[model samples]
Target: RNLRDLLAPWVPDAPSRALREMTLDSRVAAAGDLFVAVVGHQADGRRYIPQAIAQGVAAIIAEAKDEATDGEIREMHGVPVIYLSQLNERLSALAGRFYHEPSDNLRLVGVTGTNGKTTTTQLLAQWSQLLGEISAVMGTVGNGLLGKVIPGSAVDVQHELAGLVDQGATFCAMEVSSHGLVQHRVAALKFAASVFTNHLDYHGDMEHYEAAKWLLYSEHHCGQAIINADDEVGRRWLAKLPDAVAVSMEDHINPNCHGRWLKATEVNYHDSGATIRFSSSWGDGEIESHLMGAFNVSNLLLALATLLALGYPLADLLKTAARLQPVCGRMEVFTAPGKPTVVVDYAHTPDALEKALQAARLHCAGKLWCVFGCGGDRDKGKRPLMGAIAEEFADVAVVTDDNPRTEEPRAIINDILAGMLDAGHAKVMEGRAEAVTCAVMQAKENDVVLVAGKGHEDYQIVGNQRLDYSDRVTVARLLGVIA
Candidate 1:
């Protein structure tokens, strides 16, 4: 690509230089490559211009924080350096331009929230693919074209989406993290529809977090807004964004508001799956979902409303609803002959843990057992909150190690125990596998065991080592089933 053509929109008098790859790091900068130098919080990229020039970079784009003026071009060692104001803020848009705006070429749906982002995005991608579009998903689980999710960044976001487009993807379901939004990762990507699942305290405070997530609708080119009305923040947002589509499982949508809405009319929970009967502005239909829990039904409805809002026929969506597979480790259910039904979910937060336990309880014919733990070295406040949730929600709470990196395993267990009203009531175990095995072996056939916290993760970080450990595999083995 030509450097002048790439920077023509930002820099008027740009030099004409052939460029290959674009990189933020000077070490990776090579001949015919464009190196972008920006003033980041920890380090300034402009400090590496000399190194990038030495590496034979064709051109350089540096942040004009103070030393230089915006749109100013300078020649250093035959390499042209172009300056731009607030380079970090404009990185996503620039990458979008360089990648030929891939989002516009596909029906990209962005799902943002603390929980259910992965599940909702996966459902959107899977459902869209079933309805005849080459679909892809980008988020926590991984980024790839649907089932080929290669369980694995900004500019990297657009770059990955472009690669998916090049691979023949016609639609994409992307998870929008609050950090990504604040950092301007998906700022330039055009979303056909933006879906908000739910929100909780993470970004310092609830207000700050809500403001960051709100940027998707307030700042970006968010085409259609589909919000979960069950969420207090979502309901408040719905009151403001009249045109936004409201989706609810708790009948939060006002009947007289005259807004497009989707509501779960009836839902039947069973040991294997859930049967959802829903009514929406688009139409009314019944969907048989293999997914477990009530929140998942919310996630599924959000996906359904998003696609329908985008013009995928309701009848078609319902026809393919049963084929939509449950996202791995996200309320993933496993059962064997004469064994307790076990569920695996990635619920680390207090809100998510409560939801996971409540969801697991719905399918439990007998006692509900919760096997969970908080991650060490991250958000110590939630440890006790999770313990209390387990104590109040499940019949038995088994506290165990969950990637106790550098922190004493017993110390972390003690923190969780402190949350319970009666610490003696909760069972504390050092090893995660042992805790899960004990729960499964002890629970009766009619019982349902929930293995929460780390879902779909195959490795556990303990001290400085990442050991091979998976709750799915442990529970499946104990139940005589395949993970």
Candidate 2:
């Protein structure tokens, strides 16, 4: 890449020099690489300029700080340092440019919401690949061209998509987090279609959080906006975009109002998953999904609506629909030869936990059990809410520790209990593994046990250490359930 070409959009007089790679970290800077230094929380990247120079970077770009304004050129140790006023907000755009606008090279679908982002994205990748395009997914589960995934950063966002393009992936599904949206992590990249799942406690309240999500539609050039009509925020957004595709499971879609819409007319929940008879503008079809929950059915329909909006034939989608499977740690169910059915999910929030319990209740005949906890150092308001939902919905409530990072485990458990009645009746198990075991061993064969919070996550952060942990493994072994 040439410096002038990379900075053409913003920097007209940028130096003409060959640039090998771009990075924000100094430790990884190579002889011909470009080091982007920006002000950051905890530590300023400017302090690492000398280290980057020592590593033999070809050029330097620093975000304007102190007396400097935008586009100020400063020389540091024989290296060219270009400054922009608000470099933090423009990092994604710069990375997109450097990566040759990778999203444009592929069919990139962005899934945004408080819940089901991962599941919906994974479903998108799986469904797209079944349609013959090599598909990749990026989000909480890690990022790569499918099965080979690795966690990444803001710069890694563009870099990873470009890498996937290099790997011959023609389609990609990404999780657009509220934090990522607010921070401009995906600024200028184009989205072939965008899916809205739901809203939640991340922004503490809905005003700023809702605004953060709206930026995806308003700010980004997202093509074929597919929205969940069942969601309150999503319903409001559908009105804003008259041309957006509406999807619903509870007959919320107004056929006369929306030109393109998809909704399930009937849904049958079996032990394995659900059989959904759905109708959309494309036509009517049946999907016998292996995923559990009402919310999962909605997630599946969202993925279907997205692909349909993108012009994939409804007939082809119907044929390949059953091949779509459940995302890990997301309503992943396991049943042994003679043990209680165990369901594992990453439902950390009050709404997600409630939905998970409600989903499992559909499959449960005798009793419904909820085994979940709220994360420490996060929305304390949701703790009692989750607890209350577990007690009200489930026959048995097992409250336990869920990544008590820096905070006392007992305190987090207490916050959850504060929202419950017959508080003394709920099972309190501090150790997560032990809690899952207790719920599984104590529950009957007809009963269903749900282990929530750490769905696909393999580690638990206690105090300062992230210990190796997995709810799936714990539940599986206890129930002798094959994964």
Candidate 3:
């Protein structure tokens, strides 16, 4: 943990002065700590060098650009300041070094994609822990072991990962977002393995987003790659990555390939859950999971392949795979002894909604009912697309409010109903709790009810107010599935 030893690889010419710790935010820059000043899209970190210096930071590392006034090294208030070219791109490696490569000290697996990143990471952590490794997760729901995740930020991410390492976690599964990747938020960490779930049209043009994702696999610290071969983007990346493990549920695997591969050979769905039989380069096995949907099959396979690549035996995973439960709010199935099956998922995107409904349809003995809505004030373009998907996939669709924020609840529902073939087929409910209740009350015992949009989230954002609300809570309460 010596300052010179920690930063020697990144800042080769760094001064021999000893340091206590490292930080990126100027607010947390304590005396004798090294401050990393990265250049971001909105504001440059170099602008905060003086502020960091004022806090008694031992050294300052800033991103170098021709437009900036300072070069590689500058003296500020008697503090040693160093600058590096392409600092943002190399930020993870630098932070990894400063943190003594905590990820290297543990097994770090990163799950990236537009969807299923949270579920896949959660599965990786859950299954790994079940097999005896002390594991933790970092994703949308939060960061920690199962049932104890606290919400995360870029700063919180580094602190959380370091904390997990400090707590003796032998493995960590992290959900890496496109924004997180592009902004260099996780640039300073090394990953033992990385998994690609899938890509979507959101964020920006497909090309730009895809390029940013490819960087994660191409980054020097990314040790191994495990990708969903069923995804077109993932399949394309497979050809370029000879060593990458390709996982599939849609029979996308090639017979001639010799690299690591896991693919679903068959799957059976029932009202309770699904049973999947899979074959892999390591071996073949069957798993019965309470998690609903074929999408989960892909998520499960990706997690399995990742663990196998990390040296976990196939027999141990098979024995404990069934113990891997559904992630709260992501295809969480709720059913009473004599009531209909209710599934709650966080399927906000058009693609996610369609997939959720399709997965529900497979288990629906009576009818497939969808209860969903779009988030107000952001990504208005997906509202109609989501509406269209529900109508096309679910037998009965309910358009309702999902975190209306400052927007009128009725207006958000109207926008969703706008894309339906016949708006009459879809019911509009203003309150989210009412919408979920209405769906469950109307669906029969054999029917499948999918409550989408707000999966594991416990609060509803209505007009700047985050009211305590949860889809799973409402459904369980209505069906008497919870006490």
Candidate 4:
């Protein structure tokens, strides 16, 4: 692509250059790559300009500073350095143009929230694909043309989406994090619709968190809104977004509601999955999902409502609903012959942990067991809250290690126990693999065991070291179910 055409709107008089790849990191900038240097919270990309130049980059775009004597252009080793005023604010737009506005080439759905973002986004991708569209996904689990996700970056968001377009993907569902919205990671790229799941703990307070989430709809021109009215923040937003679809598991929307709505009238949980009977503005239907949990029902409904809003035939979605599967590591299930049912989930937050435990309890015929722990160097506040949830919901709350990165495992464990009423009631099993094994081996055949915090993640971060660890592998091994 020509460098001038890519930066035309922002830099109309920009010099022409043949650009192949675009990147922000100096490490990845290549001979034909266009390097975008922007000021950031951490290391300034400007400092890496010399490195990017060393990489033989075709051209350089640096963020203009608020300091005096800005917009100064200089040549470095034959590379053109053009200064753009407020480059950070314009990076997304520039990336969008360079990537050929990939979002515009497909039906792009953005899901933003504290929890359920991964599951909701995955559901949208899976369901859309089942309905015959070539679907892709971009989020925490990774990004790809569904079923072959690869871990990616914020700088590569537009680049990867453009790749999906090149691969013939007609629909894309992406997780829109608060940090991403605030950082302009997904700036200027259009969305067919945006779904809201919940809020955040790392976001500090609800005020700032809500503002960050609101930025998606307000600043980003989020297309159609499919919001979780069950959440208080979402419920409040629903009243304001009269045109947005209101989805609820609790029937939060009044029957006489003025706009489109989809809510679960009934839900039945089983060892296999859930039977969700829903009524929407379009019609009424039943979905026999192969996914476990009430949150999955909400996630599924949000996907259902989104497709309906996107003009996908309601009957077709209902017919294909049974095929929508659970995302790996998000309420992912594993069972053994003549043994207890084990569920592996990435419920890292307080609300997510609470929901996972509750979901486990529904199918728990004998005793509900929770085996979980918090990560190190994160919001210390949620440790105790997750502890409290485990205590309240599970018959046996087994506190174990969950990526005690850079922090003492025992110290983090103690913080978790601090939230419990009686610390002794919860058994402390520091080893994650053992904790999962202990739960599986100790529980009866009728019991349901929930191994939380680390779902699809295959490694544990301990003392700045990533060690091989997987709850799924541990449970399957303990159950003697795999080769």
Candidate 5:
């Protein structure tokens, strides 16, 4: 892994230099290592190249546009300087090569889309592990094995995938985001298969978001695609990629399709959970998952289709299907002896909130109670939209603070209350833990409570300070499920 070998394919014409390690940050640039200068939205990487040279970098790779003022191939204090074409787009690929393309070393399955990315990835990893394969997951919740995850950054993507391989993980299920895809965070590694959950109006409109996701399917690294044909965008994308495995919980399957496909014919949602009977290209099976809602059925089917496409036994998956559990904080259903069922989810967006409430409605016998709020700084546009969804879907909507980072909690709640048809119908509470307790105490034994937005996250970020908090802990303590 010399400096020349790392940058060879990316910058082939450049002269060779000794290499020790590869880094993106100039502060960590060491002797005989290559420094990659990326031009981000906030700051340009070229600004730090001089500092990188001072740290004794062997070679410099900066944005091609910055090559003018950043100087030529001449050494800056004995370090070679090089310019890269589309630095942002090529960073993932460069890191992939530098890490010896770890995804190829294991059976990598990528799960993408707005809603079910985390749940689908978790299911894939858990199901694969049930069949005796060393598996890991990488996504929004975190990146690592089932019980352990290190959160944040695309750098975690490379490190986690490589670490999984090093830990003898034969298979890894990763949640690839539209922003992650468009930013070229996963461009370098090859995937054995890719899964599309569903698209929503998160990043601008649906068209731009769809195009960003289509890049993963079009990339040379992806081998097979498992898509949710039920979605309007998913079905449209399926037509273009005929080889993809089309999965659906509705009648969205193509009749004359030759490629692999999985469709759920019937889904029975009870107070306990859902029993899904599905038909696929390989075979048909019934999966009784302890996860409520039709969308969970769709997520389960997508995970099943992905595993089937990767050459796993369909019957075996069905046999162990009931054993597969709901993801923590992502529509996780909690029950105690003779008590109401509680669901905790990380449904942050308007679309996600709608889905979460609707999902809870399916299994709700007494009432559907929604306790949720928006994040502080990002995406103010979705605040009222979430308010509208909660009001429209849930029987009782409890508006509370969800990570009101650096923003006034009351102001954020007021913005959300504005969307409701009648602000009188919703109750605004600033304390999240108290909100959860209120919902738990008020709801009847048969009522379904949904604690949304914060899901598996255990910290409350308020005014730049992160306080220890968890919905699971609160609910379990209230129900005496845990101490």
Candidate 6:
């Protein structure tokens, strides 16, 4: 590839230079590689320009929002350094061009909002794959084809999508983060459908968070919109976007107003899974889901409505609905005879913790025990909120460490205790494995133990060290079930 050919759309008459690959990191910039330097939240990429040049980068595109002038081209050590304003906004486009716009080559479904992004995307990918399309997913767990997923960045995103396309993927389900949206990460991708799961908060405020998530539909190439009517924001957006498909598990969608809608007529939550009876514009049917909880029913229904809107046959979707497995560590259930049912979930947020507990409660014949903690050095506010939620929802709330990065484990536990009315009642366990063990060991056969916070994560960060740990493994071992 040539540097001029890649930048032709954005910078006409650009100098020609042979390029092998595009990179954001200076350390990885090799000879004939185009290095992109932009002002990021944590560090400035332009500061690494000298390092990139020294590493033999073919060309450099930098952010001109600071000292450099927009569209300015300069030579450093005989290497071209092109500065452009709004480099962050243009990153996706440049990467798309470099990757030959992979999103355009496949049916890309973008799932936004806080809670169900991972599960919804996983469901979409699995369901689509069952319908005979080679599907992949990009989200919290990782990014790759249905069976294999490793993670990456914005440039990495386009690169991964291109990789998936190259591997013959015809459909992709991607999780659109608020930070990613606000940072214009997916600004250039073409989505076959834009799905909204639910919203809580981010961007330091609810307004900004909602607006950031809204950017998927408000801006960019969002082909079809599938919104969760159970969410207030989704309902409001449904009114504005009349053509959008409305989906609800709580009967929030008004069939008369919504042109295309899916509503659950009845849902029976059992020990193993759920029996979902639903009615939609497409048709009415029953779904025997192996996934647990009501919110998951919502997430699954959102996936159903999305595929239905995309013109996947409703009958075909129903036949394979039972085969859609739960995302690893997300509402993942484990049970053995004469042992308590243990559920592992990535419910770090207050809202997610509450929902996970509520979901666990439905399957518990006895007490519902919750074991969770907040990450160190990030969002101290949610610590107490999660504390309050666990106290209110679960019969037993065990406070434990979850990636206590650089902060003292005891201090993070105390912060969580601050929100609890009866802080003394909540057991404080410093080690996550010990906390989970304490709950699972003490819980009755009919009880349900929810090991929340770190789902599908194989490591725990203590100070500067990333120690090997997994809630799934610990719980599965304790309950005599395979992880």
Give the residue spans of candidate 1 off by over 4 A.
151-153, 199-216, 336-339, 346-354, 371-391, 397-445, 457-470, 477-481
Residue lDDT tens for model 2, 64-160: 8783668777777888888887888788888999898898899999998888898899999999999998999988878888788776456889998
**Candidate with more favorable, higher lDDT: 1 or 2:** 1
TM-score of each: 0.84, 0.78, 0.82, 0.78, 0.79, 0.77
What does each candidate score in C-alpha RMSD?
A: 4.3, 5.3, 4.5, 5.2, 5.1, 5.3
- Model 4 CA deviation exceeding 4 Å by range: 26-28, 42-55, 66-79, 152-154, 199-216, 255-257, 335-340, 346-354, 370-392, 396-446, 451-483
lDDT of each: 0.89, 0.87, 0.82, 0.84, 0.81, 0.89
TM-score, predicted candidate 1 vs. hidden true structure: 0.84
Q: In model 6, what is the error at residue 239, expressed in angstroms?
A: 0.7
Give the per-residue lDDT of model 3 (tens digit) for 139-248: 87777766777773344466678788888899899888877876767776778888889845675777776686676546546778898999888888888888999998
**Who is ahead in lDDT, 3 or 5?**
3
lDDT of 4 by residue, 125-233 (tens): 9888988889999988788898889873345788888999999999999998877887788878799998988735664687775676666458786899898999988
Q: How close is candidate 2 to the true structure, as a TM-score?
A: 0.78
Pairs that clash in candidate 4: none
Q: Give the per-residue lDDT of model 1 (tens digit) for 1-483.
A: 888999988787898999888889888898999899987779998899998998899999889888789899999988899988988889999888888889989999999888889889989999999999999999987899977989614678888998999999999999998778888888888999999898455646877766756664577999999999999888888888889999998979797873899999999988778999888888788899989988889999999999999999988898899898888888899989888999999999999889888999999889999999888888799988999999999999999999999988888899899988999988887789999999999999999999998888999999989999999999889998889
lDDT of 4: 0.84
Pairs that collide in candidate 5 are none
**TM-score of candidate 4 relative to the true fold:** 0.78
lDDT of 3: 0.82
**How good is model 3 by TM-score?**
0.82
